[model samples]
Target: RKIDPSRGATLGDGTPNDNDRIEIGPTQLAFSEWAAAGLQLPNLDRMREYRWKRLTQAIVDRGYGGLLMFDPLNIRYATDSTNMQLWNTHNPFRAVLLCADGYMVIWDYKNSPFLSKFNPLVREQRSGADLFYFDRGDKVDVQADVFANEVRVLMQDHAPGHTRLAVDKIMLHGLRALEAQGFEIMEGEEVTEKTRAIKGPDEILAMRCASHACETAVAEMEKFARAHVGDGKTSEDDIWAVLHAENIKRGGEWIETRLLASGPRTNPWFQECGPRITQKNEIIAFDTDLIGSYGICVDISRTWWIGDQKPRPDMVYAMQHAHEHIMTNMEMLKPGVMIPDLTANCHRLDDKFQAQKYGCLMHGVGLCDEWPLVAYPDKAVPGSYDYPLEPGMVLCVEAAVGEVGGDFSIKLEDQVLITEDGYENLTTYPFDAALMGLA
Candidate 1:
């Protein structure tokens, strides 16, 4: 049967045993019910502090003089700062430098230093050298001088003779300029990813709050479609729009993809949402891929059977297999489970449905999809390497069911937290009951 919106949240709101009215900005309102349910909210300061230690600890561990963080996600972790995130993902309109001696400097995107005010760890906010073709056109090199000079000066002042700077994301002009000045460029991105791979207690709490916000929005979208009840006039975007609206109204950052598809569109998979109307009993599938409240990503997928009618036998087969694929692999998550072990033991689709299997059984998810992308042998992701699962790592297991050219495809994924002992299933939305022939 379709989700009952009037029934409220199907999965419990992860209310903690304690009674507290604590709150974080993005999750405050949406999580009020969680608070009502006696949830213990994360302490924002504690989480921010939690992130700071990890970033600098990485700096100390790497034996680098300092770190140059131009990637938006790194900046988010190092300084608890954010501004124009997606844009900066490509443009790096902001950057930060953390030294071995705890000196913190951030480069703002050409303003009166606005974005870093919330982050006291940021000792100073200055120009980002304002390089890049869009900002300086033919003068990117000249701008690079400013950036390289800033790094040189900062290193000398704070970490003299420690010329090794781990630079994460930087342009060619900037890279050369730093090297010309005798600064050794190290593996910044790799170090940053490894540093963010594990989660702290406050970080997990922050994610829990954001997950509540995302799940409720998923409920709203499911409710909207269920009410439509297979109305052919309802476009895929109409149902998908509910998710964006629900997410935005409740302070979500944004959706990373337009992955909702209906009816025939669900066959090939990866078909983005469009105006196609859904037919009764047809498959309506989606992936959340949502960057939910507080910049925490909540990636979940669910397939709905239009009209709450009895699903076709093949549809039932696909749903059951996809469900098994997700759950079976999830059970393997242990503190030291190796990547090869996870993939070797992961559930697989039948040969007919194997060609279009998901890219990986699962991948990491955090500030954005992070490290240790464990892929199926055939669906290999270039540059992916094996690593053992560790406690405090969050993962999203993936499953897609469809014949090479089938009429319907079912996509399912679940976000889980890898603990020292076992895994905790974070995505709580129930599967389609009618598809399983349940009352």
Candidate 2:
């Protein structure tokens, strides 16, 4: 479908797309309901003080008039508000500006301006281009490039003569649009990445809720596992059935359907909806990655052998041992810990495992995959840098293990909460290979 050139929907009080344009779906609203209700996650609220402070401080340190964060995740981070614009995935104007003085502002047109209260820090504005969707026989749309022009005007008004403006590393289109208006752009991803990597208690608590949602699905999957994997007739449909059932059971009646691949199809991630039958006694790897969060998400995976065919000893050991590598090195998560130590540790583990020499051991899980990703296998992975570890940060140490030709490959995924003294496992289920009955 083409872009909606007229900014079709009515925004906040008949204001023809003055602020950002946001297209929100019902599920998207539900995802942000917790925060929208003014109920902060108990754990996340406690840890956010330092995180919020650091974020405000980081922008100040960057020495920019303000940082233009284009991605929804970063935008949400700045505003603590969520929207459904991401549902379409291709709309490029979903962004926010985080000023050095600690005020946040959104530039997308699809979002409701009223939601700005969700994040008291943000000051909403209108800068996104007016959208006019043209699909077959829709109404003839307007051709006004209101969004592009508004952005140029906004930059000049708020940040007049402010050279060296920082934008998100991943948002190229937004940068191009701003650049078209003569704003010199620098990658401002670090402003949010460094601050976001060390999540606060609320972020962690949100992640905890996400993890709980996922584990609940897995728990139900186990019951289905006995029938499908245990009985041998279960196919990809069966796995999908269990996933849908569990999601409904956990109150996610409209959960986004993700991959439920088995065997060969599981090798490459993102191969959505493989429909092959899951033969008994084979490896069944389930990926339950959902973007249900208005701004954040819960991405967790589980691997199980249906029947009695033992998972090769090397495979089981590789996965377990790799998990231990991350757990043992979680000391890097302390309040003052640096990023280099974690990278170096991952490198050491890589050498010991001798698998995928420099592949990442873990990544930052928030708003989006690797938004403020913490580097692994190297002290300085892209989008991450050395920052003090704080108590409220949430991390997903999904250390990818298994030799190229290993009998079985599984991603040991879990969420962690950074604490003052140490970190806590937000993920409740044990990662023990034995517990999985994979021999």
- By lDDT, the best candidate is 1
* Candidate 1 residue-wise lDDT, 295-374, digit = tens: 78899999988664588888888889999888888998988898777877777679988888887888888877888787
TM-score against native, each model: 0.91, 0.71
Please give the TM-score that candidate 2 achieves against the real structure: 0.71
Q: Residue 405 lDDT in model 1?
A: 72
Each candidate: what lDDT?
A: 0.81, 0.55
Cα lDDT of model 2 by residue, 13-70, tens digit:
1223233434232232233444344433433223334455667688667666567665
